[PDB]
Design a protein around this ligand. Sequence first.
Ligand SMILES: O=C1CN(Cc2ccc(F)cc2)C(=O)N1c1cncc2ccccc12
Lengths: 300, 300
Amino acid sequence: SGFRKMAFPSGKVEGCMVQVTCGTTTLNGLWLDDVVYCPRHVICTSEDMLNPNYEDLLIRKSNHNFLVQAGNVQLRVIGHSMQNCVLKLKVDTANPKTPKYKFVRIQPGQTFSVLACYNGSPSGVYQCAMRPNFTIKGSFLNGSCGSVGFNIDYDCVSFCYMHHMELPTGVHAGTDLEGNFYGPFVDRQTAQAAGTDTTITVNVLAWLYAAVINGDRWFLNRFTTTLNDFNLVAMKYNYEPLTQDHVDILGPLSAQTGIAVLDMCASLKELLQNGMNGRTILGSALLEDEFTPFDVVRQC
Amino acid sequence: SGFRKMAFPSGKVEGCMVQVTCGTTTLNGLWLDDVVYCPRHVIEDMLNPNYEDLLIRKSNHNFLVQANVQLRVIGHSMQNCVLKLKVDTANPKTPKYKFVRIQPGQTFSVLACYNGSPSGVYQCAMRPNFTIKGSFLNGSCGSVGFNIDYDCVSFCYMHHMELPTGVHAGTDLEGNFYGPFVDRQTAQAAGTDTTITVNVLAWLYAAVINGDRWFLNRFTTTLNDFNLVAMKYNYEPLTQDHVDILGPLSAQTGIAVLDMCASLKELLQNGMNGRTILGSALLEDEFTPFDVVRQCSGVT
Ligand SMILES: O=C1CN(Cc2ccc(F)cc2)C(=O)N1c1cncc2ccccc12
């Protein structure tokens, strides 16, 4: 029993973290086979950041302007190209530590692990979700750009996030591994606004099912609800709408616990109305939205 | 910015996990140099076991140790509550490591495993009652807890059982239990837990670092007056040592520790008056002072 915000083992990713220096800028890169991936704003100066033109800064770069250091080794760059907001550095060594991997673009509410690195050096791993506003609530100091986020599935790594910047509100924005941002952000130091964040409803339901699986039922009630009546209440608490897809996705947890999805939805409406009255659910005094149905099944 | 429950990267430790099977039971082991460490209860028996005589009756080839490869067991001995299985080949992925024993209130990372395959990593504290609120299921026995410091893995915990309240019990890597527990099927309960006061005060400091400031107050208290409120709320007494340890964060933020106790003494009586701190509605006690520093400064 017990329930933790549990990350994936970071070792397959630890072996791909390199350092990439351009001019006076240093960030982290991701070494797979003979391609090093990193965010393109490593080619930027302090005057650039308001309105850089990256095609024009890259054309001015030769292979040997890119200091790539894999731990002790200095990798020789034999080629550079750009794909959206990620720079791809070709090098003369395939990375022997290269795992089985895929690049995947996730949908908001998906969870993944983050390997925070500074100077190509892993500092720590943690779990988080893509917020519905395509932001992530991370732990990121200056210099963490290039840290990646991932899932592992039977020794195959699914890379899904590269870290590019911190927003004024304190949260973080980034891109998939084909360099396309999540959300409406750009790699530019101009005014940029995180959208209105909202609770991931289908995740909170999953977390409540986990709490039942672990043996607490104190929050259940004798009521049910319609999908539409539930959503009309949830939205007044800034919760994400629940769709039929979500309900289908929860089917396995409902079958395991014998609580209908729409009955679990009724519990949530009452939780939102009453609060928790001095109690806790799986050690949280707030309702927890960073666990997906897959997560709950994996851990339980 | 941000603040998360952050685990050490787990790559050095992943390479040390193997599968160990004696008869019907399978659990995990830790492979270091030419020895495989795993709990001694891998050998009706759990009711009233005499472990010296149960091990007498076993022979090297009773222990099927899978790393794809089967390791040949060439010897078996026991140290306190851990079985040491000698193998023919030394683990070439053996990190630099120590075995250490931590005190309650100290934190560490757990790398949970099943049939020798690493499944997840999370961060957690050793409770004042010497238990761990972890996330383990059937087959997780043998999972290890560690810290890392400047390239050296410090192993501190190995998992044996789950107690009937859902919390977990285990030993240091020399087989000495944490807390007043035994590896045997009887009724065993944990004691009245308390809250790690200094880890709450460190986490309040981390809140001030990240902008949260509403809980401070102009006033001041005495360690005497504070510890009189602490006992009332099942908080650990705050020592003179504890205050010094908070020195660095009382410097960095310019809030004296006895002031912060006033802020916390008020949080204990009046509650948080419908607010949160660092995204939690609970006072968090699983971040040590050094944990706070190490995260808000980016050591790698
Ligand atoms: O390292 C960097 C560099 N930078 C500037 C920038 C990067 C990309 C752009 F497209 C535009 C601007 C930035 O915001 N970070 C950070 C990334 N994450 C967390 C941080 C916390 C504190 C300070 C910086 C943080």
